[PDB]
Amino acid sequence: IPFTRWPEEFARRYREKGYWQDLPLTDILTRHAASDSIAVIDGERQLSYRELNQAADNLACSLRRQGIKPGETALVQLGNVAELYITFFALLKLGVAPVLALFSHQRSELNAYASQIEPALLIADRQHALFSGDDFLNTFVTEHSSIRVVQLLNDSGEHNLQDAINHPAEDFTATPSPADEVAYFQLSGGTTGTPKLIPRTHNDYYYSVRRSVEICQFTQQTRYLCAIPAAHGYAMSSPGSLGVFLAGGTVVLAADPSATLCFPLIEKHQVNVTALVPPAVSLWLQALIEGESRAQLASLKLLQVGGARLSATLAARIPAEIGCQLQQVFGMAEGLVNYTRLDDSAEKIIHTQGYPMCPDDEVWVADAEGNPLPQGEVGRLMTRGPYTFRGYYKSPQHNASAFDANGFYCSGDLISIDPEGYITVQGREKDQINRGGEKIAAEEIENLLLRHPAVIYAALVSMEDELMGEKSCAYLVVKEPLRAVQVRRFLREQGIAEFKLPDRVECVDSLPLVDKKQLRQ
Ligand SMILES: N#Cc1cccc(C(=O)NS(=O)(=O)OC[C@H]2O[C@@H](n3cnc4c(N)ncnc43)[C@H](O)[C@@H]2O)c1
Numbered sequence: 001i002p003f004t005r006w007p008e009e010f011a012r013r014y015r016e017k018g019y020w021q022d023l024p025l026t027d028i029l030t031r032h033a034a035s036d037s038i039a040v041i042d043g044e045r046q047l048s049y050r051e052l053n054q055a056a057d058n059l060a061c062s063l064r065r066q067g068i069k070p071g072e073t074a075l076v077q078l079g080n081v082a083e084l085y086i087t088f089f090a091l092l093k094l095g096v097a098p099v100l101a102l103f104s105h106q107r108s109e110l111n112a113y114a115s116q117i118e119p120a121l122l123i124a125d126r127q128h129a130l131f132s133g134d135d136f137l138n139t140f141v142t143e144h145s146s147i148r149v150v151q152l153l154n155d156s157g158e159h160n161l162q163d164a165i166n167h168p169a170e171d172f173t174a175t176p177s178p179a180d181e182v183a184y185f186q187l188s189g190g191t192t193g194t195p196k197l198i199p200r201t202h203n204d205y206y207y208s209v210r211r212s213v214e215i216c217q218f219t220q221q222t223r224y225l226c227a228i229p230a231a232h233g234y235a236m237s238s239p240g241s242l243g244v245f246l247a248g249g250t251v252v253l254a255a256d257p258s259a260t261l262c263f264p265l266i267e268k269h270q271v272n273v274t275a276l277v278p279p280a281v282s283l284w285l286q287a288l289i290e291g292e293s294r295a296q297l298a299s300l301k302l303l304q305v306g307g308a309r310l311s312a313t314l315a316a317r318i319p320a321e322i323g324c325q326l327q328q329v330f331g332m333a334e335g336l337v338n339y340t341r342l343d344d345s346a347e348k349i350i351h352t353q354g355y356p357m358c359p360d361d362e363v364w365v366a367d368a369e370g371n372p373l374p375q376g377e378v379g380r381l382m383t384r385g386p387y388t389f390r391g392y393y394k395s396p397q398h399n400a401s402a403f404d405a406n407g408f409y410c411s412g413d414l415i416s417i418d419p420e421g422y423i424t425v426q427g428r429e430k431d432q433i434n435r436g437g438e439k440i441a442a443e444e445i446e447n448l449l450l451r452h453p454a455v456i457y458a459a460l461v462s463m464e465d466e467l468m469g470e471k472s473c474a475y476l477v478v479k480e481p482l483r484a485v486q487v488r489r490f491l492r493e494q495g496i497a498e499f500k501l502p503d504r505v506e507c508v509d510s511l512p513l514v515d516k517k518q519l520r521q
Helices: 008-016 048-067 080-096 107-117 135-143 161-166 202-217 233-237 241-247 258-271 279-290 312-322 346-351 394-401 442-450 484-494 516-520
Strands: 039-043 047-048 073-079 097-101 121-125 149-153 184-188 197-201 223-226 250-253 273-276 302-306 324-330 334-341 360-367 380-386 409-417 422-427 432-433 438-441 455-465 469-478 504-507
Touching: 008 097, 039 080, 039 469, 047 048, 047 442, 048 080, 048 161, 073 080, 073 107, 080 097, 080 184, 097 107, 107 135, 107 197, 121 438, 135 184, 149 161, 184 233, 202 233, 202 241, 223 241, 223 258, 233 241, 233 324, 258 279, 273 279, 279 302, 279 409, 302 312, 312 324, 312 346, 324 346, 324 394, 360 409, 360 422, 432 469, 438 442, 442 455, 442 469, 442 484, 455 516, 484 504
Parallel strands: 039 250, 073 097, 073 121, 097 184, 121 149, 223 250, 223 273, 273 302, 302 324, 469 504
Antiparallel strands: 039 047, 184 197, 324 334, 360 380, 380 409, 409 422, 432 438, 455 469
C-alpha cells in the first residue's frame, strides 16, 4: 500500500525519542484481552474487553475464510455502534486498511472513497437509506468490482455482519501490517473537488493516541461519551475511543450530541469526559437554561471542545454553567493536535487553542510567499512531526501543493502564537466551510452546482451564524428562475451528505470572475 514515508533521519530520531514504538494498533485492545471490565456501552449492550477482542478475532477469521487478504483495503460505514470498533480491530488484525466513512455520507462520497482505494470489502448498515434495499448495492458493487465481500449490519439475509462476529474463530492468528506501514486511511476536511485520503501508519497513529492519553490523564476510571460521529479522528484518537481502550476505560456511545440523548447517558453511566463541537456546547447550555437539571452532569470532569473555534464568551460559561473543566482541542486529520493542558491557567484555556501534543511537533507561521513571521504575527500554519503525514494517498498533483520543499504541511489555517508558545486560530485560507465543526469543500459543491442546467456561475461561501459559527450560502448566476428547494433537491439527487446542502441560496445578476475575496466585499 503506497504512501509517503518519512525521511530516514526523521524515522530514526522519532524511534530514538520513543515516539514510534513499532507496535501494531491491535495491541491497544489485546493488552486487555483477558479483562472482563466494560469497554463499550451501546444502549442496553455492554461489551467487555475480553468479548470485544473475541468479536474482532471472530470477524477477522470469518473475513479471512471469505478470502480477504493482508494488504487489501476496505470501505466501512458504521455510525455510533459497537460494531464500529469490532470492525476496526478485526481489519487491523488482518492487515487490511479501511476508510471509515461517516454514517451521514452518501453516494458521491462513498463512490469517491471506493474509487481511490479499490476495496475488497464493504461493510455497511441496512439502517442507512442506501442499504435498506439492494438496488444501490447492485450498482455500487458493479461500479467498484474490486469488492468481493459485503457484510451488513441489521441484515438477516446471507450478508449478516453479526453471523460473522458471532462465529467463534477456530485457529486464528493475526497478521497486522508492519508498524511502519499503513494501518488505515483518514478523511481530510476537504479543500478540493475530490476527497483526499490520509494514510496513517501504526507507529504514527498509536503515538498520537498514547500521547493524548498522557495529556488527558485517561485511566481505567475514564468513562467517555462518544456522541459526535465516532469514526472522525477527534472522536477516535484525540484521545478518543482508542485512547479510552488503551487506558482500559469505558466508551459510552450515543447516536448524536443532543442533550435529550446525552444528559441521561451521562447521569446513568457516570460519564466523566466527553467531546463536543461548539454548537453542541451552546445547545447544552441552553438546555440547562430551559430547565434541565445541572445535576445530571455532576460526574462530568472534563469537556473537550474542538473542530471549530470556541469563542471565549462560550468557553467561560463551561466551568461556570456546567462545572467541569474545559480542554480546547485544535486538531486535524492530517496530524497535528494542539491541546490546552489540564494544569493550564484559566487565561490559556479560555482564549487559546493550546499547543502541540509532541515536543517535536514543529510549528511555524508563514507569510504569503513562504517566509517565517515573528511571534504575535498572523499567518499560515506550517507543520511537521512524528504523527503528521507526508502525503495524501495517490495524489501527486495535490501533494506538490500541500507541502513545502522541506516536508512542512500547510494546514490552510491562519494562526498567531503567544509569547508563552500557545496557538490562537485567527482565520482561514483554504476554500472550506466549517459548519459547526463539519467540513465542506466549497469547490466540491460548486462543481455539483454547475451541473445544474440553469446555473452558469456558482460560488459557495460561509456566512456568520450564531449557533453553527458558519452556515453555507450558494451564490448563483442563472439562466432562469431557481428556488433554493430546487438546488437542494438537485444536490440531494447527486447524492451528498445533508450537512453539505447550502443553508441559503441567492440568485444574483452577476458574479466577479469566481473571485470570492471580492464577493465578500
Ligand atoms: N485526528 C484529529 C482531530 C482532533 C480535533 C479536531 C479535528 C478536526 O476538526 N479535524 S478536521 O480534519 O475535521 O479538520 C481540521 C480543521 O478544523 C479546524 N479546527 C479544528 N479545531 C479547531 C479549533 N479548535 N479552533 C479552530 N479551528 C479548528 C482547522 O481549520 C483545522 O485545519 C481533528
